[PDB]
Structure 1
């Protein structure tokens, strides 16, 4: 009853791992809960308020009682508990997030971060600032190499090395890089793994 709201919150955190697990991974997190954590923050503010109040009270009334220690001990733990929840949730949220910023940006010619992450505005803007700052953070890693990378792509090794891509209602032709593949619905291109990696992440290509 004392610290249990955090147990319920992480209990809810678990569900998103369930949705990232088997899964299938489309992202589409329901929302970031600002309300329930606001409840948590009001509860914890309550706590630390009574804490400094009693911290004033030992200075006068309690007179360093053996019992007093407990309040600064036990209730202190509760602060930690909320923290233990609040970060555990939060890191989970960054884990479901940064990976998404990894596997797709997105990808050639990134060329900008847009239309991605169906959560969009529904997810908190505090995370989105972190996010845009994070893909800005990875742009520098993109700028050190000189591989070339394409780090974002090709998690799965090339074979061999030409494939066949079947158009999937995409228009097209937007293939400007390397060559004008001239995208055309209902058209399969007997194209090398090279531009396939880049174009498959977008949603144009279908069968590898």
Structure 2
């Protein structure tokens, strides 16, 4: 029946939402199901051809006020259902992409559809526009854990040599440990070079 592929697609949606929700990290989302989506879009085209065929044969008009009305209603509702299933899948994966944009890129690519790849590019461009115009005094993409401490100890987890900061340097020697202002190192904790807190 015309709705079954929609159920299979949104079961895929439910499983990938759980795959994202259960883990503490941002898990890189799974492959875009082009095959099931092609099957559903083909089903939509079948339903469109059915409506065209019926609306042509309404000029012959077989009990049309009830029978053709009912046939048209059912084949229209099948298309509404399949639109809902497709949009549910795409809106979920869109939400995950937006979450990933804020969590990383505002500071696995094969799995996206090419529309989703260019969508993500545009949404990252939008985020970087927000933290560039007005309100730029706040890095709007920064952390949402409240600042617990102004100075922290941080252990260098990967080597990165001598780099500057606003009035000094760090030499990121492997398994050296700093005691430093948190606001000067947060970028490197997010990039995974520094360990603690």
TM > 0.5 between the two? yes
Contact 1:58 1:68 in 2 (8 A): yes
C-alpha RMSD over aligned residues:
2.4
Structure with the larger RCO, 1 or 2 (CA within 8 Å, 6+ apart): 1
1:40-55 residue pairs with structure 2 within 5 A? 40-55=40-55
User: Equivalents in 1 of 2:83, 2:145: separation in Å?
Assistant: 38
Q: Deviations over 1:46-67 (max 9, x none)?
A: 1111111111111224263411
| Contact 2:20–2:29, Cα closer than 8 Å, also in 1 | no
How far apart are residue 75 of structure 1 and its match?
Answer: 1.2
CA apart distance, 1:14:
0.8
TM (norm. structure 2) is 0.91
| 1:165–1:190 contact (8 Å) kept in structure 2 | yes
Distance 2:88 2:167 in 1: 44
- In 2, Cα distance between equivalents of 1:146 and 1:48: 48
Where 1:156 maps in the other structure, the secondary structure is coil
- What secondary structure is seen at the aligned counterpart in 2 of 1:60? coil
Consecutive unaligned residues in structure 1, runs of 5 or more: 109-119
| Number of the residue aligned with 1:35 | 35
CA distance in 2, matches of 1:175, 1:20: 36
For residue 173 of structure 1, give the secondary structure of its aligned residue in structure 2.
strand
1:197 Cα deviation after fit: 2.1
Q: Secondary structure at the match of 1:36?
A: helix
Residue 167 of structure 1 contacts residue 188 of structure 1 at CA under 8 Å; is this kept in 2?
Answer: yes
Note the C-alpha offset of 1:23: 1.3
Output one character per residue of 1:19-50: Cα deviation in whole Å (capped at 9) or x when no partner: 11121323222211111100110111011111
Q: For residues 170 and 145 of structure 1, what CA distance do their matches in structure 2 show?
A: 36
Question: CA offset at residue 175 of structure 1?
Answer: 4.9
Q: Which has the higher strand share?
A: 2
Q: What are the ranges of 5 or more consecutive residues in structure 2 without an aligned counterpart?
A: none
- Secondary structure, counterpart of 2:195 in structure 1: coil
Q: In 1, are the aligned partners of 2:26 and 2:100 still within 8 Å (CA)?
A: no
Q: How many residues align?
A: 197
CA distance in 2, matches of 1:30, 1:83: 21
Out of 178, 184, 195, the residue aligned to residue 189 of structure 1 is 178
Q: Is the 8 A contact 1:165 1:191 kept in 2?
A: yes
Listed one character per residue, the Cα deviations across residues 82-115 of structure 1 (whole Å, up to 9, x for unaligned) are: 111011111100111111100223539xxxxxxx
Q: Tell me how far apart the structure 2 counterparts of residues 18 and 179 of structure 1 sit (CA, whole Å).
A: 45
